[PDB]
């Protein structure tokens, strides 16, 4: 089970 | 080769966001807490490509 996790509504944007 | 970028849930709501496994069939993603996905499953597949219990 690839899991590939993008939480977006605060932390979702490094660098 | 290898992307797809396909949100297609059971939410009916295309937004990649949490936790999100590939339906091992459609290459498609989908949040682990609607679909009840353990992320450590062998195997995910969609309730389209293998029909399970969603109770939401
Ligand atoms: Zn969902
Ligand atoms: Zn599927």
Redesign the interface.
């Known amino acids: 089970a690839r899991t590939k996790q993008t939480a977006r509504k605060s932390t979702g944007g490094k660098a | 080769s290898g992307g797809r970028d396909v949100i297609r849930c059971i939410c009916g709501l295309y937004k990649?966001?949490?936790?999100?496994?590939?339906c091992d069939k459609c290459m498609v993603?989908q949040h682990?807490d609607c679909m009840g996905?353990?992320?450590?499953?062998?195997?995910?597949l969609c309730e389209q490509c293998d029909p399970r219990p969603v109770d939401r």
């Not at chain 2, 353990?38 to 195997?43: F, I, K, L, Y």
């Open positions: 990649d966001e949490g936790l999100m496994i590939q993603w682990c996905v353990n992320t450590d499953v062998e195997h995910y």
